[PDB]
A paper describes a structure:
The biocatalytic reduction of the oxime moiety to the corresponding amine group has only recently been found to be a promiscuous activity of ene-reductases transforming α-oximo β-keto esters.
To assess if the introduced amino acid exchanges affected the overall structure and the binding of the oxime, we also crystallized the tyrosine variants in complex with selected oxime substrates. Interestingly, the binding mode of the oxime substrates also did not change in most of the structures. The propanoyl moiety of oxime 1b points into this cavity and is likely stabilized by hydrophobic interactions. Testing the tyrosine variants for oxime reduction showed that the exchange of the non-canonical tyrosine Y370 to phenylalanine in OPR3 led to significantly decreased product formation compared to the wild type (OPR3_Y370F). In comparison to the wild type, the non-canonical tyrosine variant Y370F of OPR3 showed a 4-fold decrease in both kred and Kd in the reductive half-reaction and a 3- and 2-fold decrease in kox and Kd in the oxidative half-reaction. The effect of the Y370F mutation on the oxidative half-reaction is a clear indication that this residue has a role in the catalytic mechanism.
Numbering used by the authors: 10 to 283, 297 to 385
Write the structure that this text describes.
Amino acid sequence: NPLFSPYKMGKFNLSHRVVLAPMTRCRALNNIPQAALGEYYEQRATAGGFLITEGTMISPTSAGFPHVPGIFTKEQVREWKKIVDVVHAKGAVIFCQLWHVGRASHEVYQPAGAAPISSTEKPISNRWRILMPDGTHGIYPKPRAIGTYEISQVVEDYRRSALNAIEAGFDGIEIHGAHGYLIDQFLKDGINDRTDEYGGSLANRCKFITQVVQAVVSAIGADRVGVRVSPAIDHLDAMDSNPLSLGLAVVERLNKIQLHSGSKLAYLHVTQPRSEEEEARLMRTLRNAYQGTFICSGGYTRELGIEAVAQGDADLVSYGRLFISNPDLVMRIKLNAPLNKYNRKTFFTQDPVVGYTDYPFLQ
Ligand SMILES: Cc1cc2nc3c(=O)[nH]c(=O)nc-3n(C[C@H](O)[C@H](O)[C@H](O)COP(=O)(O)O)c2cc1C
Ligand SMILES: COCCOC(=O)/C(=N\O)C(C)=O
């Protein structure tokens, strides 16, 4: 089973290739990591296994879900340290995903009820609805298009949050540049209509992600930085006219950051949408173009994960939904044991136990 061959992710020695994908679960009440998160990640941690946290706020304006953790205050850093310690006690490696939602927010999630920020004033269309704190669904509002000074402040928010993650003991961070959130709102020409130096050309649309990655690399070192993108996922009205070219442009800029820094990033992490042959070709083209470690995600199974590693399509495979309901997913994949079903109704509820830590281990 090639999923259980070791892998050197830079300075981290992984014992197997099964990764916990980042998943928002909304149990971090008031944006403060809670003890329940420690139990949840501890259940899924394995010796030499790699975990990526739920998306984590970089600033008071970065959220678009209820009760998601932040890492921009010292109180948040203190509580994260307790969780990181219990994960490290099991021998796992853990990265904190840094997440700004941009226009994918609502007045209820913003300080003083202000408008969310974005590359443009275009809202997500009414085809999509936002989960509200009371469990109903609301309307995405028109965002405020930020100028270049404010862009530089957001870059600094990523940098400070990366330093805070290291202070909490995280092994590294992942930049969430996928799924139609803030970075993707600059990348995708279906959203970014700017006429300044951050819009127009493919090069200009890639400027923001380049500056973010450069800032965190300078702060904590390239080998502690992963980058997640999704050029071919259209979530929240985030489409590009040429997804493969957009993806290769991002890959080119990551390759150049590495040469400039004299070090490789921890990895490139790409979601696929789920013809199948074309979509796999898109993924393999990005993998082949990138000088480093490649993590694939999106609809993977035991069989598909084994085939991805064996055929050289990916170095690591991340699993989301099956890790929700199978705390021992790594062991079950190793043994080819039957998997437990997941309950979508409790993906984003606030209960510290129900649908969170009460999925059973293998019987
Ligand atoms: C409940 C839930 C929350 C998610 N939250 C995030 C997130 O915070 N950050 C992120 O990059 N992806 C997020 N995603 C996507 C997952 O990381 C992953 O790509 C996806 O679940 C992989 O597909 P799979 O569930 O078929 O394994 C989330 C997915 C789910 C189901
Ligand atoms: C198209 O698949 C959905 C992609 O968006 C996500 O997975 C996500 N965060 O990135 C959440 C919080 O749901």
